[PDB]
Design a protein around this ligand. Sequence first.
Ligand code: ZN
Ligand code: ZN
Ligand code: ZN
Ligand code: ZN
Lengths: 452, 366, 263
Amino acid sequence: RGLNRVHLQCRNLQEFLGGLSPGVLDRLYGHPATCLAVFRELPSLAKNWVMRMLFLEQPLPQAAVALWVKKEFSKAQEESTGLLSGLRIWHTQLLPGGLQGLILNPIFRQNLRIALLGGGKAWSDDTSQLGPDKHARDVPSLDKYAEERWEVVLHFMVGSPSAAVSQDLAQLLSQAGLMKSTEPGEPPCITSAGFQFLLLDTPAQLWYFMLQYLQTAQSRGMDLVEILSFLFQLSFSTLGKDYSVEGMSDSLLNFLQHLREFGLVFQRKRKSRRYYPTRLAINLSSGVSGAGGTVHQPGFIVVETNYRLYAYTESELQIALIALFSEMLYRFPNMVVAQVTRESVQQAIASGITAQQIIHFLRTRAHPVMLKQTPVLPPTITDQIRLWELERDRLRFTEGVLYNQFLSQVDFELLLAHARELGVLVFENSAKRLMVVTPAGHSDVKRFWKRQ
Amino acid sequence: XXXXXXXXXXXXXXXXXXXXXXXXXXXXXXXXXXXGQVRLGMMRHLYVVVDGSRTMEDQDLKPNRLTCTLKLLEYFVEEYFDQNPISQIGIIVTKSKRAEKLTELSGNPRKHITSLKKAVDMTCHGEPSLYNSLSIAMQTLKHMPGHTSREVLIIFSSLTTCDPSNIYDLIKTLKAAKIRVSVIGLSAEVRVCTVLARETGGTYHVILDESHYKELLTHHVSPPPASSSSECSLIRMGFPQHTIXXXXXXXXXXXXXXXXXXXXXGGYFCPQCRAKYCELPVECKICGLTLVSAPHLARSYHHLFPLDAFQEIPLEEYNGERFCYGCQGELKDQHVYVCAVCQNVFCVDCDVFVHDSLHCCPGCIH
Amino acid sequence: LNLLVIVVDANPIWWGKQALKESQFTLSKCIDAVMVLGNSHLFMNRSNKLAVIASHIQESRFLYPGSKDGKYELLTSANEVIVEEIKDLMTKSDIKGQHTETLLAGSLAKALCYIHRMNKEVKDNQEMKSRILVIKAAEDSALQYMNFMNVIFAAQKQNILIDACVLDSDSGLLQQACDITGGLYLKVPQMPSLLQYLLWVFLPDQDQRSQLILPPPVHVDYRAACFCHRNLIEIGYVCSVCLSIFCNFSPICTTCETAFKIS
Ligand SMILES: [Zn+2]
Ligand SMILES: [Zn+2]
Ligand SMILES: [Zn+2]
Ligand SMILES: [Zn+2]
């Protein structure tokens, strides 16, 4: 903790896909699920530009792309162009003079056109013929199955006596940095990343599972490309119509039964030929479930100006979460009454939670009577929460290297200028020659001192 | 002191639900709308006289009566200029036994709503004066042309109607000057306003609620029918086309405006005097012509070939057309509404939408 | 959350003359450009909604409302129902002679009340913006002008934008509608490129009209004639009973048989 604390940063599919290898990307767009899934992530400018340039075989010059936009919006324009360029959609070509032509990656473009129009592949859908299936599953029972399995995983993180995790998933939770095993006679603890993982949205939690699951996909003979194509194949599916398995490798079978352990997919049998993509699997998307209401579950916490939480939900999980960032007084078979004490939040940040998790948690589960307010939370309470976290987080730490008490002043700004030159300047002085450089990048300037 | 005994229970599980449903159903009501195939007064110099009395400060409404009255007049100016474009409004606050022409007779909502946002901040001191307010409204409404149904709307609260002269000779004059005065009253019925309303030709009403008062002002939005007295003339009209800066201002006519203005390059001319107006419709400031874009005649054509009634039937009743002919949806409630001519099927949402906004049956167009 | 309501002027007489013309561009590419615009609109965001109406000569029947060939699945089901609905509509058809010019007021009326009910469907967190595309290819009848203005003013009140792609001929009432409501008007100069016009001009929503530089607004003619001789008027005589435009001054008002007071 001589570094900074573990701030749980969602990648939002840009820092994930921007930062890979372009051969991995050119294989990744080889299924239309991935092309639609990268398409909908785009900002609306880049969205409309791809849908503009889609039906086209000529590299348009740079002048037309810069000349399609009104003058006031150039600050919010270069982000869309740069995001198309870095994500290997727009590969740059040349008109035969000096006009740098721009053209969509024909793998990406061809598979988007397969996603919109007729195609040569078949989305890996198959059925030999099996009609009304032996133990066909019902849609609210798929909802129930999703709730049961993913709340079992959440109770496992919380540490209930409902610990039905089958110890590959527990090893996954230990490997992703969430449940640290210490002193190996089996206490599984919770890391502060686990507490910040709990207060997050359900699609954000599942997508963080998939990102930190594929972060260590070099382990079990897994490849990123086929797994991400299967994820984007799941989240573009329908609860009603039923699928088959024939057309999948054996490592896909191991991933799909591990995914059954996640609860995102309802099988019937392990040796079966059918899977039901669950309601958790459809809403798998890098985004935000809302600020007043969730498609998954309607909100249930009434936050009054008395710093008073009225939770209309019976669940030991969500009672434990409201125990995390508050303190609880009454429990009725319909309702829990809790009070947000200063000391409760200062306990919730001692274990490590930046209180944007808390405010977004309460905005996610906002009860439908708490709605029809344009500030859905009372801003006295919200600004008080932010003032409490700013009292707790008042130290900012940085490892540095000192320059003090120089013999001159020309070498002072010379060392400062060489620090600014190689981008290793941290903190400077004006009067008493007290400089802070990066300590890992200090040996460059130190060997420069042995050279002058 | 024992209203708590209003909640009965028979099975107590859905019986409290039945008591709550009876209360929530008794807390609502429907409007009463009238149809007519009669002549209407469509050019309409209406002139609003508000109290500024002592009784405007009484708190019978949820804010004091000045604030609620002024809010619904803001809504009134909005809906009246939204529905009748040719017409005009003028606002008099009547205050301290004297009458004050607060906003002159014009035809754009910006000045009137700006003046009402100003007039929130007033004082409301003294007793009103119906004599002087009807005198100022008469003085402006003498010389509007005879086909205009010249109308005054007095939103009147107090009871002591402190005039400085005799107000039956005004009612005889205003009877002879073919004006029409309608009074919306607060808290009471006053005999003089009743004689004024029944003799000039208008209609008198007293206020229960917010909702009833909205219903009364909505009743006075629509053009009221004409007597056997008002002139049926033929006003000469002008239809100026829009003119942009002709061909990149190749020999244009750079003007300022005609009523803090910038340099106008182009816009609307006049076919009588050839002046320069920014906005249309505007009465010609230097000619006396009235200038009309002519959807502004089409904005008020629904009064002339009006709607009809929907045959309202709640029960199931022979319905072999399960879906709404309005918007292709099922009829999940027990209210089915069937037109007169085509006799198609409509639901409640299509009922409110057709009868309030679209103003035509979608079937009868086909 | 957005709501595109495409309206395709399926005049069977006009597209029949277009298909006997033996051109490149027939009704099949028209309805296919409609469906590619629809799948593009559903494709741009998850929350978007689509509804496609087809004005026939005597009826406003809606067109709208696993993956065998590789599309997204709901796009496949929507394309299947639009294809089967136009095949049920146009093939099984009728013939009449007194009413053979197409209509646009009724389909716009259905679109207005459909947007009304789908705005009642919207919950309190989200808010719906809406527009009506009109793909017109025939000649509009004059006889429904009394009706037609009304639906425009409904779209003036309900804040629904109106856009129009006219294919063959200009239309004064429809460029009038796209001037009043704040929408957009476009006369295509070459038929088979229709989709590429739609995917740049008429695909972008309300918060991209202000960002994109678009083809400029044509000047709108506020021509006005009498009900007497149908000729163009710069100064007219309008009654205050009938509210009707007369060109020359006349004693007895014909439109409402008014006993005109003469001064
Ligand atoms: Zn003039
Ligand atoms: Zn009808
Ligand atoms: Zn309906
Ligand atoms: Zn007349």
